[PDB]
Amino acid sequence: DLKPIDVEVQAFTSASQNISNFTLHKYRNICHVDTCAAHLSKSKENKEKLQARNLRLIVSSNEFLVVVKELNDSTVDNVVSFNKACAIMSAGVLKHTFDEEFDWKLSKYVKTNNTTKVIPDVKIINRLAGQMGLSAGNPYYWMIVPGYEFLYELYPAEVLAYTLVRLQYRKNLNIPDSMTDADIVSSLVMKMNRIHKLEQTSFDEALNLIGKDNVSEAYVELARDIGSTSKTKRNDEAILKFRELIASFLPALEADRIA
Amino acid sequence: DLKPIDVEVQAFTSASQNISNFTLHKYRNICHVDTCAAHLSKSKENKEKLQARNLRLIVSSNEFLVVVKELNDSTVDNVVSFNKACAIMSAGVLKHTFDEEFDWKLSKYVKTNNTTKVIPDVKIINRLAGQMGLSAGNPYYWMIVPGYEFLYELYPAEVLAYTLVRLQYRKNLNIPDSMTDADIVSSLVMKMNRIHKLEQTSFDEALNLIGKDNVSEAYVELARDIGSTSKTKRNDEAILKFRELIASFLPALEADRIA
Amino acid sequence: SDLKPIDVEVQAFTSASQNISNFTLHKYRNICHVDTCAAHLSKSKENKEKLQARNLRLIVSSNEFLVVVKELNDSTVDNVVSFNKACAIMSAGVLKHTFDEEFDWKLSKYVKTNNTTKVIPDVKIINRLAGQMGLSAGNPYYWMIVPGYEFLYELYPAEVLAYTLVRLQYRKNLNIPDSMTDADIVSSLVMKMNRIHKLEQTSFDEALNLIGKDNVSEAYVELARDIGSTSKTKRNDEAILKFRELIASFLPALEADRIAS
Amino acid sequence: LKPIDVEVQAFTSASQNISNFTLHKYRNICHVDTCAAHLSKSKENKEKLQARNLRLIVSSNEFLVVVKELNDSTVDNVVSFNKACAIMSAGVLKHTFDEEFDWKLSKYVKTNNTTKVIPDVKIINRLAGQMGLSAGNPYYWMIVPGYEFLYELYPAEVLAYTLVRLQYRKNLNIPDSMTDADIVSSLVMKMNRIHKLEQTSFDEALNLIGKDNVSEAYVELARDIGSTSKTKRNDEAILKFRELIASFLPALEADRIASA
C-alpha cells in the first residue's frame, strides 16, 4: 500500500557547497585606471541600474566584469557581486596611489612593485570621498567606494581606519540610525575572520600584526577634513524648524479633529 | 542567460550636473490630463525601464518628453530627468484640482485661470497616494509623485506640508529606514534655497512669505487620514478594548465556575 | 538625435490592474460534505507541512475540490485559495451544522441558519487544536478552532472575537510563542473588523454593541471554561526550569575551558 | 499548479498508538557512509516525503520505508522521518562515540565494534556546520532531525545538545515560531518513557546518567557555538574598535595643531 519511491544515495559534499574563495590577487592587472575610476565615480547610478538589470562593465581593452545581485553566485571569475566589482576596480586604481600592500606570509607591508606609473585622472570626482572632505588627488580618494571592505587583504590598516571613521563620524557621513554599530563593522569583521581565524585568534593579535600605528596614520589622514557643508547645516536647521511647525500645528490638528 | 546591459564608461566630473534653471512655467499647457495621470500611475514601471533606455513619453497629441537619468539632464526643454518629468506631468493634472497657485512677484497665491473644466479620470489609481490615505478624487491625489519637490515653485505651502507629513509619519508611509531625516527634506531645502536665498534669508522669513496659515491648512488636510489609517493604532486600541471586555466577563466566568 | 529613446505606450494603472476580489464565505456555503471537511481540518498540521513542498488538491465533496496554494498568484479562480481561506471554508461547512445562528449584516443581528439536512460531525474525528484548549469532541465550537478562523467573523462575529479574546488572555496555556506580539494575535481579526465595520469612521464599541457584548460573553465563557494544563505541559515547564539550573551549574566549567583555549 | 492529491484520512484516537521503539533492533543495518549520505540530504528527503513515501537503502542488505508520522507502523522497517534519521545516526555514531549507555548497569559501557570505520570526512552535515562543528567531530552526525531518539544510547550527549538548543536558539537559527517548551518536548517525552518522570524526579534522572557527563558534553558543544557567533565577534570588535579610536587622540591633536 505504501508504494514508496526510490531515493538514490547522493551525498552532500563540498562539490555541492558554495566554493567562494574570492581573492583580489586574481584580478590585479585587469583595469585601465581611468576606466575603472570612471565606473567607480558612477557607483550610485550603477547601483540604480543594477536594480533592473545585470551590468557588463568593460574595465580594459582585454577584460570586462558581469555585475549581478549576489543571489546569482557563480564560480566564473568575471561574474561578481556589486561590492566585489567595486573592490576589484578600486584595487586597480589604488595600485597606483598606495605605495605599499600587505604580504600575509611575511606579516608586514611591502612595496607595491608597479612597472607602469599612472596618475588617476584628477578630474574624475568621487562624491563619497567628497562627502568626507577628501579632494581629488588624495591617495585614499578611490578607496571610498562600496564594498571597500574586500580591500582589507591588500590594505588592512587603511580599510580598518576607514571603518573606524564610519563608526566615529556617523552623523557627518549621513549614516541612518537604522544601521547599528555592528551593521557598520560586520562586513569588515567577516573579512578579518577569514584571514585572521578569529575563532582561534584575538582582535589584539590581529591589530598588532597589521600595526596599530599604521591604522593610526590612516585614521588621522581620513578624519582630517570631516565636518559639515552649508547644505548639511541647512538640512539640519530645516528639520528642527520643520518640527517646530509640526508642533505649532497641533491646536489646529485637534480643532479639525473635533469637527 | 544573465542578459547584461552594456554600461557606457562616462566619468562623473564637475561638468556632469545641469545646474541650469528649471521653471514649470514653460510647461503649463503640454499635458492632456488623463494621459499624464496615466504616465504618473506607472511611475514605478517607467523608472525600471529608464535604467536600460531613455524614454519617450507622449503627454498630449502636440507634445512629448524625453526622459533621461539625472546626469543626462539638458537645457533642451523636452529632455528632462525622471523627477522633472513627473513634476511636469503632476503640474498638468494639479492645474485642474488646485484652485490657486503662487505668484512670487506679488508674494501671494493667485487664482489659476483654466479655459477648460477638466476632472482627472477618477479610475486612474495612484498607488503612492493610497499609501498615505488619499483616495482618488482628492485634489492632492496626483501631487503624491516622485520629484514632487519641484512643485514648490507653484504650490509651496502644499509641497512643504507633504514634506512635513513625510518627516512625521515616515514609518506609516513605509519610508525605508535606510533614509535619514535629512534625506527626506534635502530636495525641498535645495529648492527653497534657490528661491528664498537661505544664505541671506531665514527659514522664518521664507515661511511667512508663503504663509504659515497656508502650510497649516494643507498639513491638517494631508495629516488627517494617516491617523485614521494606522494599522498599529487600530491594533493597540483593539488590545485595550479586548482586555476591557475580558474584565467585563469575569463575573460571568466565576458564575460559570460554580456551576 | 543621439539619446535614441524607446517609446512607452500610455497604459494607465486601474483597479483592473490591482484586482483584489472580495472574498466571502457566502459563495462556498454548500461545497462541503461535513465529515470530509472535518477530516481535512483534523489534519491541518500535516496539510500545512505538505503545502511547504507542493500545492494541495483537497476534495471537499463529490462535486467540489479546493486547490490550496502559498500566496495566491492574484487567484481570481474561486477554487484556488490560501491555507487559511481553505481552512475557513471547510470550517464554515461544518459549523453550518453545529451553530444554530449566523449574522445578517443588513439586519445587524443574528438569524437562524436555514439547514434542511441536519448532520452531526463524526465525533471520532479529533481536533488537536481544540483539545489543547480543553474542548472535547461534540462541542459545537470544536471545528471553529482552526487556522484562519478569523475569516469566519463575517458569519459568527461574536464567536470569532471570543476565541481571539481567549488567545490574547491565555497565551501561555495555548503555547503561543513570545515572538508573537499581542498585536500579532489580534491583527488579522482587526483587519476583518475594519473591512466590515469601517473602523476609520466607527468605534470599537459601536461595532461590539451591534454584534452584541452579551453574545461575545456567552462564547467567551464557553471557550475559556476548561483552559488549563496537562501533565505533559507541566513536565515541559519543570524541565525548562531544571535545564536552566544545569546551564548555570556549568558556567564554571565553560569559563575554565575558554581561557585554557 | 501541479497540486498533489491529499487523501482524506481523519485524525482519530487510533491515528497514534503508543508503541515501543528501541534503537537496539537496528544497530547493524547501516553501511556507515551510506547512512551518512542520507543524513546529509535530510532537508531534501523531507521535501520528497511530503509527496511520496520514501525507500532508503541503508546497506546492501537492508532498507527503510520512510512515512509521515501518522503512518508509523510496528513493522520494523516502516519508520517515521525522525526515527529513520535517528536509526541512521546511531549507525554512524557507533563508530565515533566510544561509549554507550547500559540501563541495566545504570552507566556508560564501552561500544565494542568488530570493524574500525571512519565516516567519510567529505560528507557534510549542513546543520552541524552552522552549529560550529566541522567534519570529523565525533558529534558531527548527531546533529540531525529526530536526534532525541538517541537518548536511549547517548543520554548525556543528547541532553547536552538539547541544553545548547535552548540557550543558543538564536545562534542556531531556530525559528522564533517555537516556544522554549517546543524545544524540549520531544526529549522530555523520551525521558518520561525511560525514567518514569511521574514517579521520578529530574534530579534523580540526571544523577543516574551523570551531571558530570552532561557538563563535559555541554562545554564541548557550547564552546564551538561561542567561537562561531557572528553577533559575538561584532560586539567584541566594536569594543576593541572604540578603544583603538581613543588611542588616536594624541596623534589627532598633534594633527589639529599642525593644521593650525
Author numbering:
A (entry chain B), B (entry chain D): 52 to 310
C (entry chain C): 51 to 311
D (entry chain A): 53 to 312
Task: Give the exact sentences the study uses for this entry.
The N protein serves as the main building block for the RNP assembly, protects the viral genome from endo- and exonucleases, and helps to evade the host’s innate immune response.
Finally, the structure was refined against a 2.28-Å-resolution data set with excellent statistics. The C-terminal subdomain of the core (C lobe) consisted of helices α4 through α10 and was followed by the C arm, a 33-residue-long amphipathic α-helix. Interestingly, unlike other bunyaviruses’ nucleoproteins, the FMV N presented one disulfide bond between C82 and C87 that was observed in all four copies of the asymmetric unit (bottom).
